[PDB]
Design a protein around this ligand. Sequence first.
Ligand code: ATP
Ligand code: ATP
Ligand code: MG
Ligand code: MG
Lengths: 584, 584
Amino acid sequence: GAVLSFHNICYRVKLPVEKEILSNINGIMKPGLNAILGPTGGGKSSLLDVLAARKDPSGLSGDVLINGAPRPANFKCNSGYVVQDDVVMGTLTVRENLQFSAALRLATTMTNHEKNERINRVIQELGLDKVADSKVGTQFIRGVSGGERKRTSIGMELITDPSILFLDQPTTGLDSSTANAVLLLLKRMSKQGRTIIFSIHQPRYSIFKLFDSLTLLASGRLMFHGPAQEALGYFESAGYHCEAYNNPADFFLDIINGDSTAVALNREKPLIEKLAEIYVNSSFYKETKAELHQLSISYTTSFCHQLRWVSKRSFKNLLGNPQASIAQIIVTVVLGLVIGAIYFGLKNDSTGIQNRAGVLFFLTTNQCFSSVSAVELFVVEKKLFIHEYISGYYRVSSYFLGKLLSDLLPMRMLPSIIFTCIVYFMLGLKPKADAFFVMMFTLMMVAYSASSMALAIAAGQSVVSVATLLMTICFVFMMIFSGLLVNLTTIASWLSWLQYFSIPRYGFTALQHNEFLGQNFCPGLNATGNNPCNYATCTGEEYLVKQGIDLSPWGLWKNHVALACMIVIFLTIAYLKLLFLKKY
Amino acid sequence: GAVLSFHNICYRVKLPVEKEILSNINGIMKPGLNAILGPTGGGKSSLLDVLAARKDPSGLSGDVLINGAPRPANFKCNSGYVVQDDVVMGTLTVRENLQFSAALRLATTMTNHEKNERINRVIQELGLDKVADSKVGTQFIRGVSGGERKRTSIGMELITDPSILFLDQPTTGLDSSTANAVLLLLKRMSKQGRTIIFSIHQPRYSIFKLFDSLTLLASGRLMFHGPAQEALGYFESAGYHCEAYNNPADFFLDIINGDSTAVALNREKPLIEKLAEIYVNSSFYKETKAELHQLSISYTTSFCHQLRWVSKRSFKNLLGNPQASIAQIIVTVVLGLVIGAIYFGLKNDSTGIQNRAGVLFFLTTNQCFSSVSAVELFVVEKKLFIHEYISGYYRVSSYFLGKLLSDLLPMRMLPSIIFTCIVYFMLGLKPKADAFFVMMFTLMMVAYSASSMALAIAAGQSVVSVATLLMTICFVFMMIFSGLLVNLTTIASWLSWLQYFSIPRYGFTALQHNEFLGQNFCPGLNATGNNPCNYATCTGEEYLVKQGIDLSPWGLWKNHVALACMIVIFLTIAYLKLLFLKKY
Ligand SMILES: Nc1ncnc2c1ncn2[C@@H]1O[C@H](COP(=O)(O)OP(=O)(O)OP(=O)(O)O)[C@@H](O)[C@H]1O
Ligand SMILES: Nc1ncnc2c1ncn2[C@@H]1O[C@H](COP(=O)(O)OP(=O)(O)OP(=O)(O)O)[C@@H](O)[C@H]1O
Ligand SMILES: [Mg+2]
Ligand SMILES: [Mg+2]
C-alpha cells in the first residue's frame, strides 16, 4: 500500500495581504480509510488539495511524501481527487461521463467491452441505474439531481481504481443510507490496499465505525491525528466525557467548535489554542513525529487515443446542440446570395473592376469577421479543461488538437466551401476549374488564420469580453491596410510595415491575383483606344501593377505561405497559453 | 401564521418522453418547522419548487394554497427560497451580498443604518465573522469555502425575514455543530409564527427533535406525512421496530431505501409501492384529506431604488475587474492614432475626398464592430438574473436599465469622446466648434445602435457563441449597403430597401454631410477649370449629390432620428427577451 506522509505543512493566501490558512500540520496516512473531520472553514479542502498536489507551491511550506519518497510526475495518472463542487459535463449523460473517464484513464490493454462492464458495475454499486441514461444537468436545463450528480463525480474517479484516492466531502448531498452504502463501498475498496483520504461532514455512527485514521482540523490547526478508535479515549483525558452524545463524531465537533459565534448565540486562552497545545504535548504527536523523521509525465493512454476522444466528445456537443453551426450555415447562404445578387452579371466595362475588386473585399471580410466566434472555443469549457487536466485525462496537445477539429471542420472549412460555391455560379468570376479551388483554398486560409488569432487572444481566459473586443478592433486595424480604401504605396515608410500583419491584405491580394490574370476590360472599343477618361485600365495585369502585386505565380502563393505562417504562430501562442495557464 | 397546503400535486418532465417525478402527494404545512426527508432522487427539491411556485405549470397537476386561498402575485416579495447549489455573486463580499439583498428586499422605511445592524446580527448568528469581509469565490478564483458560501446563501434569504421560508438542504455542506446552530436559529424563528419548509439530509438527533412536521419522499411518492414525534410509532405499527438505531431519522431512511441497489450490493410487491399503500390506508392520510377539503406584483422597493443598486453593484464589478474597460480605451487610443497618422494632413486635392470619405468609413466601422462586446452583458450573469428575479429583488425594467448604464457609460460613451478627440487635432477635419460635437454625437449613436442590436440578439441566451456570430455577419451585411464600395443608386429596386437597415449607412452619411458642407477641393486651379480628368468634384456639395444625400439640414438629422429609432426598437426587443424568458 501507499503511505502518504505530510510534514510541517503550512499554507498562505495572498488576498498583498497574506492570510495563514493551514498552520503547522503533521500526519501519516497509511493504507486504510482516513477521515478528516472539522468545522466549516477549518482547512479541510485546503489540506486535501495540498496532499493531492493541487495548490500553488509559492505559498506552501512543507513536503508531502509517498512511501518516504517525493511525488513522481506520474501522480495524477495514479491518484484520484473527487472535488467538492461537482465539475461534470452537463451535455453528456451519467453513462457517457463514465465512458469518457474510463476511456482515457484506463489502459487500452482493456477492450471497450471490458471497460463498459466495469462502468455497469460502478453504476450498480453507486445506485445510478434510474439515471444512467439521463443527462447530467447544466445550470439552465435541469437534469440529474444534486446527489445523483455527486455520485457521478465519485464514480468517474472510481472506475480508474487508483491506489491513493482523495474525496472532498463525498457524502455531502447524500442521505443517511446512500452515504453508508458509499463508505461501505470505500471500506471494501480500502481493504484491497488502497489508501483513501477524505474529508466528511456529519458521519453517523455506522460511518464513523469504519474509519481507520482520524484527523481533526479547526481554523487551520490540527486538533487531533491518530486512530479513530483511540480518539474518544483521548478527549476523556483532556476533560471531556462522552455520554451526552451517542455518536462520537457529534461529540468531537462540539468540542472543537465551541468558540463559534453561531453556537454561542443559538441555545447558548482561546479554545483552539488550548486544544492545539494539548495535542502537541500529547503522545499521539510524539508517535507521529518519531515516524515522520524515520520516513524522511507518462500518461496512461497515448496521444492518438486521447485525440480521438476529446474530439469525439466535442462532436457530440455540436450534434447535440447545433445552434451555432446551423445559424452559421444559414447566414452564410443568405449573405452569399446577397453578394451574388448585388454584383450579378459582372461585365468587362470601365466600371467592371471596381465591382470585381469590391466583391472580393466582402468575401475576405466575411471570413475574417466571422472568426470572432472562435473566441468561445477555449473559454466556455475552461473550468472543465482545468479539472480534467489536473485529474490526468489528457495532454494539453491532445485537448488542443482535438478541440480544433470541432471548430476547424464544422465552422471554418464547411462554410468556406458553401460560400465559395454560391458566389461562383451567380457572379460570373474566373470560369476555369483551378481558379475555383484556389479561391476556395484562399477563403479557408483567411478563415483559419483569423480563427487562430481568435484562439491566440482567448486561450486560458475566463470571459470572452476582452478577447472579442481585441478581436474586432484588430480586424478594423487590419482592414485599413488591406489595400482597398487607402493606397498601400502612398503610406509612409514607418507605417507601411503594418500591412504585413493584415490577414485581409493577404487574402484580398490572393483573390485579386487569382481573378485579374488576363481578363480584359477595354474591348468593346472604338477605333482610337477607348474614350472614357481616367484613361483606362485595360487588362487585369495593369490593375495589379497599380496595386503593387507580383504577376508571377509566386505572387499568388506568397499570400498563402504568409497565412500558413500566421496559423502556425497563432496556434503556438494559443497552445502555450493553455499549457502555461495556472491550473491550481 | 401561514398554512401552506398542497393537494393532489403531480409533476411531469419532458425529456417527447414524459417522466413522472412526483406522483400523488397531499399535505399541510402549518406554522412551525416542517422537514422533508428522503433518499437521493426521491423528489425533494422538485416538491420544494412546486411549493415555492418555481416549476413550469404545464407539467404541474395540483394546487398549492396559502391559508385556503391561492398564491397572490405578491409572493416572491413575501417568501424566501434558499436554493441548493448556492447562486451567489463571487465578485462581491459576504457582507456586500448581504447588503445587496437587504437593500432591495427590505422597505426604505428602514434606514441604511438599521439595515446594516440587521446584517451584522445575521453574520453573528450564522458564524460568518471571519469571512464577512472576504470575497465569495468564483469557480476560478478560490475564496470563501463551500459551507461558508452556503451560510451566505442562507443569510440573504434571512435578513428579509419572510413568513414562509423554504430551504433546499440548508445543512448540506455544514458540520455537526454549525448545522445544529442553524436549525436552532430556525426553531427560534419558527416560534415567531413563520412557517419553515425544508428538505434535509442526515439530521442528528438534536436536529430531528426540533421538527414539528415530517414528510418522507421516496421515488416521487409520499411515504409518510404528519407530526415528527408520531412518526416513530407509525413504523412500529407497520412492522419495523426502532432499537437498532439510536437516531430515528437514520431509522426512517433505512426503511424507505432498502430497495436501492447501492444498499443491496454493499454489506447486503416493490418496497415503495408497499410503503405507499400503507400510508394511504393509514389514519395520518385520512386526517390530512379531511382538512384539505375543509381548506379548499407590488414589489417591496420602488423602481428608482432598484435602479440605483443594480447599477451600483454593476459599477463595482467594473471597478473591481477593469480588464475589458482598460483594454477598450487602450486599443481605441492606438487605433485613433493610427487612423490619424495615415490620413495626416488632409489636403484639398483631386485625391482629398477619397481620403476624407475613407477616413470616415473606418470611424463608423470602428464604432459598429466594437459593439460586439455588448453581447456578453446579459449572458455572463444570466443565472444570477434568473435567480434574483424569481426571488423578487427587482423588476426586469430596473435590472435592464441599471445594467445598460454600466455598458453605456464606461464602454460606449467614453470611448466615443476619446476617439473623436484624437482624430480631430491630428487629421484636420471641419475645424468649427459645432461640427466637432455633431461628429462626437454621431459616433455615439452608431455605438449605441450597434450595442442595442448586440443586446437584442443576446438577451436571455446562455452562450455568446450564436449571438457573436450573427452580430458580425449582420455587420458585414450592413457594411455592403453603407454606400462606399457599391453605389446605392445602382443597386436594383428589390435590394435597395436593405440600405435602410444599415447602422453604418446612417453614421457614414451623417459624417459625410457634417464634413463635406462647403469645403472646396478644386482651388489651386489654373486659368481653365482644373485639368485633371475625371472631370473633377470641386465642392463638397457636388460629392453629396453624387452619393444621394440631402443638402438640407434635415439631411443630417434624418440619420440620427433613424439611429434613435433603432435604439428604441432594439432595446425593446432586448427588454422583452429578458421579460418573456422562461425562468422556471
Ligand atoms: N484561496 C483562498 N482565498 C481566500 N480564502 C481562502 C482561500 N483558501 C482558503 N481560504 C479560507 O480558509 C478557510 C478554510 O478553507 P477550506 O475550504 O479548506 O475550509 P473547509 O473546512 O473545506 O470548509 P467546508 O468544510 O465548509 O468546505 C475558509 O474559511 C476560507 O475562507
Ligand atoms: N427537469 C428534470 N429533468 C430530468 N430529470 C429530473 C428533472 N426533475 C427531476 N428529475 C429527476 O427526478 C428525481 C428527483 O429529483 P430531485 O432533485 O427532486 O431529487 P432530490 O430528492 O432533491 O435529490 P437530492 O436530495 O439528492 O438533491 C431525480 O432523480 C432527477 O433525476
Ligand atoms: Mg471539506
Ligand atoms: Mg433536497
